[PDB]
Coordinates of C-alpha atoms in Angstrom, one line a residue:
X1 CA 0.0 0.0 0.0
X2 CA 1.1 3.5 -0.8
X3 CA 1.0 6.5 1.6
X4 CA -2.5 7.2 2.1
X5 CA -2.5 10.9 2.9
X6 CA 0.8 12.1 1.5
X7 CA 0.1 15.8 1.8
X8 CA -1.2 15.6 5.3
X9 CA 2.3 16.6 6.7
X10 CA 2.4 19.3 3.9
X11 CA -0.7 21.0 5.1
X12 CA 0.3 20.7 8.7
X13 CA 3.6 22.4 8.2
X14 CA 1.8 25.2 6.0
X15 CA -0.6 25.8 8.8
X16 CA 2.1 26.0 11.4
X17 CA 4.0 28.3 9.3
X18 CA 1.0 30.6 8.5
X19 CA 0.0 30.7 12.0
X20 CA 3.4 31.8 13.2
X21 CA 4.6 33.9 10.6
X22 CA 1.3 35.8 10.0
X23 CA 0.0 35.3 13.5
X24 CA -0.6 39.0 14.4
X25 CA -2.8 39.8 11.3
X26 CA -4.3 36.4 10.5
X27 CA -8.2 36.2 10.6
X28 CA -10.6 33.7 9.1
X29 CA -11.7 34.1 5.4
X30 CA -15.4 33.2 4.9
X31 CA -16.0 29.8 3.5
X32 CA -19.5 29.5 2.0
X33 CA -22.0 27.3 3.7
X34 CA -21.7 23.8 2.2
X35 CA -18.1 24.2 1.1
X36 CA -16.2 23.5 4.3
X37 CA -16.2 19.8 4.4
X38 CA -17.7 17.7 1.4
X39 CA -17.9 13.9 1.2
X40 CA -18.9 11.4 -1.5
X41 CA -18.3 7.8 -2.1
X42 CA -16.0 7.0 -5.0
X43 CA -15.0 3.7 -6.7
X44 CA -14.2 2.2 -3.3
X45 CA -13.7 4.6 -0.4
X46 CA -14.8 7.8 1.2
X47 CA -13.6 10.8 -0.5
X48 CA -13.6 14.1 1.2
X49 CA -12.6 17.7 0.4
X50 CA -11.3 20.0 3.4
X51 CA -11.4 23.6 3.0
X52 CA -9.3 26.3 4.8
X53 CA -9.2 29.9 4.5
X54 CA -7.6 33.0 5.9
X55 CA -6.9 36.7 5.2
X56 CA -4.4 39.4 6.3
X57 CA -4.1 43.2 5.7
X58 CA -1.8 42.4 2.7
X59 CA -3.3 38.9 1.7
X60 CA -6.9 39.0 0.4
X61 CA -7.1 35.2 0.6
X62 CA -5.0 32.3 1.6
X63 CA -7.1 29.2 0.9
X64 CA -6.5 25.4 0.5
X65 CA -8.7 22.6 -0.8
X66 CA -7.3 19.3 0.7
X67 CA -8.8 16.3 -1.2
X68 CA -8.3 12.8 -0.1
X69 CA -10.1 9.6 -1.6
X70 CA -7.4 7.2 -0.8
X71 CA -3.8 6.7 -1.9
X72 CA -5.3 6.9 -5.6
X73 CA -6.7 10.5 -5.3
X74 CA -5.0 13.2 -3.2
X75 CA -4.7 17.0 -3.9
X76 CA -3.6 19.9 -2.0
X77 CA -4.4 23.1 -3.8
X78 CA -3.0 26.0 -1.6
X79 CA -2.8 29.6 -3.0
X80 CA -2.1 32.9 -1.6
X81 CA -3.8 35.8 -3.3
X82 CA -2.5 39.4 -2.3
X83 CA -4.8 42.3 -2.0
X84 CA -4.9 44.5 -5.1
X85 CA -3.0 47.6 -3.6
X86 CA 0.1 45.3 -3.5
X87 CA 2.3 44.3 -6.6
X88 CA 3.1 40.9 -5.1
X89 CA 2.9 37.8 -7.0
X90 CA 0.5 35.0 -6.4
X91 CA 1.9 32.0 -4.6
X92 CA 0.4 28.7 -6.0
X93 CA 1.1 25.2 -4.7
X94 CA -0.8 22.6 -6.7
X95 CA 0.0 19.1 -5.6
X96 CA -1.9 16.1 -7.0
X97 CA -1.5 12.4 -6.8
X98 CA -3.3 10.0 -9.1
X99 CA -2.9 6.4 -10.3
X100 CA -0.8 7.8 -13.3
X101 CA 1.5 9.5 -10.8
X102 CA 2.3 12.9 -9.2
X103 CA 1.6 16.4 -10.6
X104 CA 3.6 19.0 -8.9
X105 CA 3.2 22.7 -9.9
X106 CA 4.8 25.3 -7.5
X107 CA 5.2 28.9 -8.5
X108 CA 4.9 32.6 -7.7
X109 CA 2.8 33.5 -10.6
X110 CA 3.8 37.0 -11.3
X111 CA 1.5 39.9 -12.3
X112 CA 4.0 41.2 -15.1
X113 CA 6.9 39.9 -17.1
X114 CA 9.0 42.9 -17.4
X115 CA 12.6 42.9 -16.5
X116 CA 12.0 45.2 -13.4
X117 CA 9.3 42.8 -12.1
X118 CA 11.7 39.9 -12.5
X119 CA 14.4 41.9 -10.9
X120 CA 12.2 42.5 -7.8
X121 CA 10.7 39.0 -7.5
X122 CA 12.3 36.3 -9.7
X123 CA 16.0 37.1 -9.2
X124 CA 16.0 36.8 -5.3
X125 CA 14.5 33.2 -5.9
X126 CA 17.1 32.0 -8.4
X127 CA 19.3 30.1 -6.0
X128 CA 16.3 28.5 -4.4
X129 CA 14.9 27.6 -7.8
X130 CA 18.1 26.3 -9.1
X131 CA 18.8 24.2 -6.1
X132 CA 15.2 22.5 -6.1
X133 CA 15.1 22.1 -10.0
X134 CA 18.0 19.8 -9.8
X135 CA 15.9 17.3 -7.9
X136 CA 12.4 18.2 -9.5
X137 CA 13.0 18.1 -13.3
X138 CA 10.6 19.6 -15.8
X139 CA 7.3 17.8 -16.1
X140 CA 6.8 18.0 -19.8
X141 CA 4.0 19.8 -21.8
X142 CA 2.8 30.7 -20.1
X143 CA 1.9 34.2 -19.6
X144 CA 1.4 33.4 -15.9
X145 CA 4.7 31.4 -15.6
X146 CA 7.4 32.9 -13.4
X147 CA 11.2 32.2 -14.1
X148 CA 11.2 29.9 -11.0
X149 CA 8.1 27.8 -12.0
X150 CA 8.4 24.2 -10.7
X151 CA 6.6 21.7 -12.8
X152 CA 7.6 18.2 -12.2
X153 CA 6.2 14.7 -12.2
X154 CA 7.9 12.5 -9.3
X155 CA 7.5 9.0 -9.9
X156 CA 7.8 7.8 -6.4
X157 CA 6.1 8.9 -3.1
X158 CA 9.5 9.3 -1.5
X159 CA 10.3 12.0 -3.8
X160 CA 7.3 14.0 -2.9
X161 CA 7.9 13.4 0.9
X162 CA 11.5 14.7 0.4
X163 CA 12.4 16.9 -2.5
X164 CA 8.9 18.3 -3.2
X165 CA 8.4 18.8 0.5
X166 CA 11.6 20.8 0.9
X167 CA 10.7 23.1 -2.1
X168 CA 7.2 23.5 -0.9
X169 CA 8.7 24.8 2.4
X170 CA 11.2 27.1 0.7
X171 CA 8.8 28.6 -1.5
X172 CA 6.3 29.5 1.2
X173 CA 9.0 30.9 3.4
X174 CA 10.5 33.1 0.5
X175 CA 7.0 34.3 -0.5
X176 CA 6.1 35.2 3.1
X177 CA 9.5 37.3 2.9
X178 CA 8.1 39.1 0.0
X179 CA 4.9 39.8 1.8
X180 CA 6.4 41.3 4.9
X181 CA 8.6 43.5 2.8
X182 CA 5.8 44.6 0.2
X183 CA 4.5 48.2 0.6
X184 CA 1.0 49.5 -0.7
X185 CA 1.0 50.9 -4.1
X186 CA -0.7 54.1 -4.4
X187 CA -0.1 55.2 -7.9
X188 CA -3.6 55.1 -9.6
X189 CA -2.1 54.0 -13.0
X190 CA -0.1 51.2 -11.2
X191 CA -3.2 50.2 -9.3
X192 CA -5.2 50.0 -12.6
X193 CA -2.6 47.5 -14.1
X194 CA -2.5 45.4 -11.0
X195 CA -6.1 44.8 -11.1
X196 CA -6.2 44.0 -14.6
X197 CA -3.6 41.4 -14.1
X198 CA -5.3 39.8 -11.2
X199 CA -8.6 39.7 -12.7
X200 CA -7.1 38.1 -15.9
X201 CA -5.3 35.6 -13.8
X202 CA -8.2 34.5 -11.7
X203 CA -10.6 34.6 -14.8
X204 CA -8.1 32.1 -16.4
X205 CA -7.9 29.8 -13.1
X206 CA -11.7 29.9 -12.7
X207 CA -12.5 28.8 -16.3
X208 CA -9.6 26.5 -17.0
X209 CA -8.7 24.8 -13.7
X210 CA -8.2 21.2 -14.1
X211 CA -9.8 20.2 -10.8
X212 CA -13.2 21.1 -12.4
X213 CA -13.3 17.5 -14.0
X214 CA -12.4 15.8 -10.8
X215 CA -14.9 17.7 -8.4
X216 CA -17.6 17.4 -11.2
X217 CA -17.4 13.6 -11.1
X218 CA -17.2 13.5 -7.2
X219 CA -19.8 16.2 -6.4
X220 CA -21.6 17.2 -9.4
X221 CA -21.3 20.4 -11.4
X222 CA -23.4 22.8 -9.3
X223 CA -21.1 22.2 -6.3
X224 CA -18.0 22.3 -8.5
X225 CA -18.9 25.6 -10.2
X226 CA -19.7 27.3 -6.9
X227 CA -16.6 25.9 -5.3
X228 CA -14.4 27.3 -8.1
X229 CA -16.1 30.5 -8.7
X230 CA -17.1 31.2 -5.2
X231 CA -14.1 30.1 -3.2
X232 CA -11.1 28.9 -4.8
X233 CA -10.9 31.7 -7.4
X234 CA -13.5 34.0 -6.1
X235 CA -12.2 37.6 -6.8
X236 CA -14.6 38.2 -9.6
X237 CA -17.6 37.3 -7.6
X238 CA -16.5 39.4 -4.7
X239 CA -15.9 42.3 -6.8
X240 CA -19.1 42.0 -8.8
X241 CA -20.8 41.7 -5.4
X242 CA -19.5 45.0 -3.9
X243 CA -18.0 42.8 -1.1
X244 CA -14.3 43.2 -2.1
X245 CA -13.0 46.6 -0.9
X246 CA -9.1 46.8 -1.9
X247 CA -7.0 46.3 1.0
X248 CA -10.0 45.8 3.4
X249 CA -10.6 42.7 5.6
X250 CA -13.7 40.6 4.5
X251 CA -15.8 40.3 7.6
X252 CA -16.0 36.9 9.1
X253 CA -16.7 35.7 12.7
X254 CA -15.5 32.1 12.3
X255 CA -12.5 31.3 14.3
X256 CA -9.2 30.4 12.9
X257 CA -9.2 26.7 11.9
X258 CA -6.3 24.5 10.8
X259 CA -7.4 20.9 11.3
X260 CA -10.2 18.8 9.5
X261 CA -13.6 19.6 10.5
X262 CA -15.7 16.5 11.3
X263 CA -18.8 16.3 9.1

Protein backbone atom coordinates (compact mmCIF):
# COMPACT_ATOMS: atom_id res chain seq x y z
CA UNK A 1 0.00 0.00 0.00
CA UNK A 2 1.15 3.54 -0.83
CA UNK A 3 0.98 6.45 1.59
CA UNK A 4 -2.69 7.21 2.12
CA UNK A 5 -2.58 10.95 2.89
CA UNK A 6 0.78 12.08 1.52
CA UNK A 7 -0.07 15.79 1.73
CA UNK A 8 -1.21 15.67 5.37
CA UNK A 9 2.29 16.64 6.61
CA UNK A 10 2.42 19.31 3.88
CA UNK A 11 -0.77 21.00 5.10
CA UNK A 12 0.24 20.67 8.76
CA UNK A 13 3.56 22.42 8.10
CA UNK A 14 1.88 25.15 6.04
CA UNK A 15 -0.70 25.75 8.77
CA UNK A 16 2.01 25.93 11.43
CA UNK A 17 4.04 28.34 9.32
CA UNK A 18 1.09 30.57 8.42
CA UNK A 19 -0.05 30.66 12.05
CA UNK A 20 3.40 31.66 13.32
CA UNK A 21 4.63 34.06 10.64
CA UNK A 22 1.33 35.87 10.01
CA UNK A 23 -0.03 35.39 13.55
CA UNK A 24 -0.59 39.06 14.38
CA UNK A 25 -2.84 39.77 11.39
CA UNK A 26 -4.29 36.36 10.45
CA UNK A 27 -8.09 36.15 10.53
CA UNK A 28 -10.55 33.70 9.03
CA UNK A 29 -11.72 34.14 5.46
CA UNK A 30 -15.41 33.21 4.89
CA UNK A 31 -16.00 29.68 3.57
CA UNK A 32 -19.52 29.58 2.02
CA UNK A 33 -22.00 27.31 3.75
CA UNK A 34 -21.74 23.86 2.21
CA UNK A 35 -18.10 24.06 1.09
CA UNK A 36 -16.17 23.44 4.32
CA UNK A 37 -16.24 19.63 4.28
CA UNK A 38 -17.77 17.76 1.35
CA UNK A 39 -17.81 13.97 1.24
CA UNK A 40 -18.77 11.49 -1.46
CA UNK A 41 -18.34 7.81 -2.18
CA UNK A 42 -15.93 7.02 -5.03
CA UNK A 43 -15.06 3.71 -6.68
CA UNK A 44 -14.18 2.14 -3.35
CA UNK A 45 -13.85 4.51 -0.37
CA UNK A 46 -14.97 7.76 1.20
CA UNK A 47 -13.56 10.83 -0.57
CA UNK A 48 -13.64 14.17 1.23
CA UNK A 49 -12.58 17.73 0.44
CA UNK A 50 -11.49 19.90 3.37
CA UNK A 51 -11.39 23.67 2.92
CA UNK A 52 -9.26 26.21 4.79
CA UNK A 53 -9.39 30.00 4.41
CA UNK A 54 -7.50 32.97 5.89
CA UNK A 55 -6.77 36.64 5.25
CA UNK A 56 -4.51 39.48 6.40
CA UNK A 57 -4.09 43.18 5.72
CA UNK A 58 -1.90 42.31 2.72
CA UNK A 59 -3.37 38.91 1.76
CA UNK A 60 -6.86 39.06 0.23
CA UNK A 61 -7.16 35.28 0.65
CA UNK A 62 -5.07 32.29 1.59
CA UNK A 63 -7.11 29.17 0.88
CA UNK A 64 -6.53 25.46 0.60
CA UNK A 65 -8.56 22.60 -0.77
CA UNK A 66 -7.26 19.34 0.66
CA UNK A 67 -8.76 16.36 -1.19
CA UNK A 68 -8.36 12.74 -0.16
CA UNK A 69 -10.05 9.72 -1.66
CA UNK A 70 -7.36 7.25 -0.71
CA UNK A 71 -3.87 6.67 -2.05
CA UNK A 72 -5.15 6.94 -5.63
CA UNK A 73 -6.73 10.42 -5.25
CA UNK A 74 -5.00 13.17 -3.28
CA UNK A 75 -4.88 16.91 -3.94
CA UNK A 76 -3.53 19.86 -1.99
CA UNK A 77 -4.39 23.12 -3.76
CA UNK A 78 -2.98 26.02 -1.71
CA UNK A 79 -2.87 29.55 -3.13
CA UNK A 80 -2.02 32.94 -1.64
CA UNK A 81 -3.90 35.88 -3.17
CA UNK A 82 -2.57 39.35 -2.36
CA UNK A 83 -4.74 42.39 -2.05
CA UNK A 84 -4.88 44.55 -5.19
CA UNK A 85 -3.00 47.47 -3.59
CA UNK A 86 0.18 45.34 -3.58
CA UNK A 87 2.31 44.32 -6.57
CA UNK A 88 3.07 40.93 -5.02
CA UNK A 89 2.85 37.78 -7.13
CA UNK A 90 0.56 34.95 -6.24
CA UNK A 91 1.93 31.83 -4.60
CA UNK A 92 0.42 28.67 -6.03
CA UNK A 93 1.14 25.19 -4.67
CA UNK A 94 -0.86 22.63 -6.66
CA UNK A 95 0.01 19.10 -5.53
CA UNK A 96 -1.88 16.21 -7.15
CA UNK A 97 -1.44 12.45 -6.72
CA UNK A 98 -3.23 10.03 -9.06
CA UNK A 99 -2.88 6.45 -10.32
CA UNK A 100 -0.79 7.74 -13.22
CA UNK A 101 1.56 9.42 -10.76
CA UNK A 102 2.31 12.77 -9.15
CA UNK A 103 1.72 16.22 -10.66
CA UNK A 104 3.47 19.08 -8.86
CA UNK A 105 3.11 22.74 -9.88
CA UNK A 106 4.77 25.28 -7.57
CA UNK A 107 5.18 28.90 -8.59
CA UNK A 108 4.94 32.55 -7.69
CA UNK A 109 2.74 33.48 -10.62
CA UNK A 110 3.77 37.04 -11.49
CA UNK A 111 1.55 39.97 -12.26
CA UNK A 112 4.05 41.19 -14.87
CA UNK A 113 6.82 39.77 -17.06
CA UNK A 114 8.92 42.95 -17.29
CA UNK A 115 12.61 42.99 -16.44
CA UNK A 116 11.95 45.17 -13.38
CA UNK A 117 9.32 42.79 -12.00
CA UNK A 118 11.67 39.85 -12.57
CA UNK A 119 14.46 41.84 -10.91
CA UNK A 120 12.23 42.47 -7.89
CA UNK A 121 10.65 39.02 -7.43
CA UNK A 122 12.30 36.41 -9.64
CA UNK A 123 15.98 37.16 -9.19
CA UNK A 124 15.96 36.84 -5.35
CA UNK A 125 14.55 33.32 -5.86
CA UNK A 126 17.04 32.04 -8.44
CA UNK A 127 19.30 30.27 -5.93
CA UNK A 128 16.34 28.48 -4.34
CA UNK A 129 14.96 27.55 -7.77
CA UNK A 130 18.24 26.20 -9.19
CA UNK A 131 18.72 24.20 -5.99
CA UNK A 132 15.33 22.49 -6.16
CA UNK A 133 14.98 22.09 -9.93
CA UNK A 134 18.03 19.79 -9.76
CA UNK A 135 15.83 17.27 -7.94
CA UNK A 136 12.51 18.17 -9.62
CA UNK A 137 12.99 18.02 -13.40
CA UNK A 138 10.63 19.62 -15.88
CA UNK A 139 7.37 17.72 -16.13
CA UNK A 140 6.77 18.03 -19.86
CA UNK A 141 4.05 19.78 -21.84
CA UNK A 142 2.78 30.60 -20.13
CA UNK A 143 1.88 34.25 -19.59
CA UNK A 144 1.40 33.40 -15.89
CA UNK A 145 4.68 31.48 -15.53
CA UNK A 146 7.50 32.92 -13.47
CA UNK A 147 11.17 32.13 -14.17
CA UNK A 148 11.14 29.93 -11.05
CA UNK A 149 8.11 27.80 -11.97
CA UNK A 150 8.62 24.27 -10.62
CA UNK A 151 6.63 21.85 -12.82
CA UNK A 152 7.61 18.26 -12.15
CA UNK A 153 6.26 14.70 -12.07
CA UNK A 154 7.88 12.62 -9.32
CA UNK A 155 7.36 8.92 -9.97
CA UNK A 156 7.78 7.75 -6.36
CA UNK A 157 6.08 8.88 -3.16
CA UNK A 158 9.50 9.21 -1.50
CA UNK A 159 10.42 12.00 -3.94
CA UNK A 160 7.27 13.87 -2.89
CA UNK A 161 7.94 13.41 0.83
CA UNK A 162 11.52 14.73 0.52
CA UNK A 163 12.39 16.89 -2.50
CA UNK A 164 8.91 18.27 -3.18
CA UNK A 165 8.39 18.93 0.54
CA UNK A 166 11.60 20.95 0.87
CA UNK A 167 10.74 22.99 -2.23
CA UNK A 168 7.18 23.50 -0.92
CA UNK A 169 8.68 24.78 2.34
CA UNK A 170 11.26 27.08 0.78
CA UNK A 171 8.81 28.75 -1.63
CA UNK A 172 6.30 29.45 1.16
CA UNK A 173 9.01 30.97 3.37
CA UNK A 174 10.48 33.05 0.52
CA UNK A 175 7.01 34.26 -0.45
CA UNK A 176 6.21 35.30 3.10
CA UNK A 177 9.50 37.23 3.06
CA UNK A 178 8.17 39.16 0.04
CA UNK A 179 4.83 39.76 1.77
CA UNK A 180 6.48 41.23 4.89
CA UNK A 181 8.54 43.65 2.76
CA UNK A 182 5.75 44.59 0.33
CA UNK A 183 4.35 48.11 0.57
CA UNK A 184 1.03 49.51 -0.67
CA UNK A 185 0.92 50.80 -4.24
CA UNK A 186 -0.68 54.25 -4.28
CA UNK A 187 -0.12 55.29 -7.90
CA UNK A 188 -3.55 55.04 -9.61
CA UNK A 189 -2.05 53.99 -12.95
CA UNK A 190 -0.14 51.16 -11.27
CA UNK A 191 -3.25 50.09 -9.34
CA UNK A 192 -5.26 49.90 -12.57
CA UNK A 193 -2.70 47.54 -14.15
CA UNK A 194 -2.37 45.41 -10.99
CA UNK A 195 -6.15 44.92 -10.95
CA UNK A 196 -6.19 44.04 -14.66
CA UNK A 197 -3.49 41.41 -14.22
CA UNK A 198 -5.17 39.97 -11.11
CA UNK A 199 -8.56 39.70 -12.84
CA UNK A 200 -7.03 38.13 -15.96
CA UNK A 201 -5.22 35.48 -13.92
CA UNK A 202 -8.21 34.64 -11.73
CA UNK A 203 -10.56 34.48 -14.73
CA UNK A 204 -8.11 32.09 -16.39
CA UNK A 205 -7.95 29.85 -13.30
CA UNK A 206 -11.70 29.89 -12.62
CA UNK A 207 -12.45 28.97 -16.23
CA UNK A 208 -9.71 26.44 -16.97
CA UNK A 209 -8.74 24.87 -13.63
CA UNK A 210 -8.18 21.10 -14.03
CA UNK A 211 -9.94 20.21 -10.78
CA UNK A 212 -13.27 21.03 -12.44
CA UNK A 213 -13.33 17.59 -14.04
CA UNK A 214 -12.42 15.81 -10.81
CA UNK A 215 -14.86 17.75 -8.62
CA UNK A 216 -17.68 17.38 -11.15
CA UNK A 217 -17.32 13.59 -11.07
CA UNK A 218 -17.20 13.49 -7.25
CA UNK A 219 -19.87 16.07 -6.34
CA UNK A 220 -21.63 17.18 -9.53
CA UNK A 221 -21.43 20.34 -11.60
CA UNK A 222 -23.32 22.81 -9.40
CA UNK A 223 -21.14 22.24 -6.34
CA UNK A 224 -18.02 22.33 -8.52
CA UNK A 225 -18.92 25.67 -10.13
CA UNK A 226 -19.79 27.25 -6.79
CA UNK A 227 -16.56 25.98 -5.22
CA UNK A 228 -14.42 27.26 -8.09
CA UNK A 229 -16.03 30.63 -8.74
CA UNK A 230 -17.24 31.17 -5.17
CA UNK A 231 -14.23 30.13 -3.12
CA UNK A 232 -11.12 28.80 -4.87
CA UNK A 233 -10.94 31.61 -7.48
CA UNK A 234 -13.56 33.96 -6.10
CA UNK A 235 -12.20 37.47 -6.79
CA UNK A 236 -14.60 38.23 -9.63
CA UNK A 237 -17.67 37.22 -7.61
CA UNK A 238 -16.53 39.27 -4.62
CA UNK A 239 -15.91 42.28 -6.84
CA UNK A 240 -19.20 42.06 -8.75
CA UNK A 241 -20.89 41.62 -5.37
CA UNK A 242 -19.39 44.78 -3.94
CA UNK A 243 -17.95 42.84 -1.01
CA UNK A 244 -14.36 43.29 -2.13
CA UNK A 245 -12.84 46.57 -0.98
CA UNK A 246 -9.16 46.80 -1.88
CA UNK A 247 -6.94 46.22 1.14
CA UNK A 248 -9.93 45.76 3.46
CA UNK A 249 -10.71 42.66 5.51
CA UNK A 250 -13.71 40.61 4.48
CA UNK A 251 -15.96 40.34 7.56
CA UNK A 252 -16.05 36.85 9.06
CA UNK A 253 -16.60 35.78 12.68
CA UNK A 254 -15.53 32.15 12.27
CA UNK A 255 -12.47 31.34 14.41
CA UNK A 256 -9.18 30.30 12.88
CA UNK A 257 -9.21 26.63 11.88
CA UNK A 258 -6.22 24.55 10.78
CA UNK A 259 -7.49 20.98 11.30
CA UNK A 260 -10.11 18.76 9.67
CA UNK A 261 -13.69 19.65 10.55
CA UNK A 262 -15.70 16.45 11.25
CA UNK A 263 -18.84 16.35 9.13
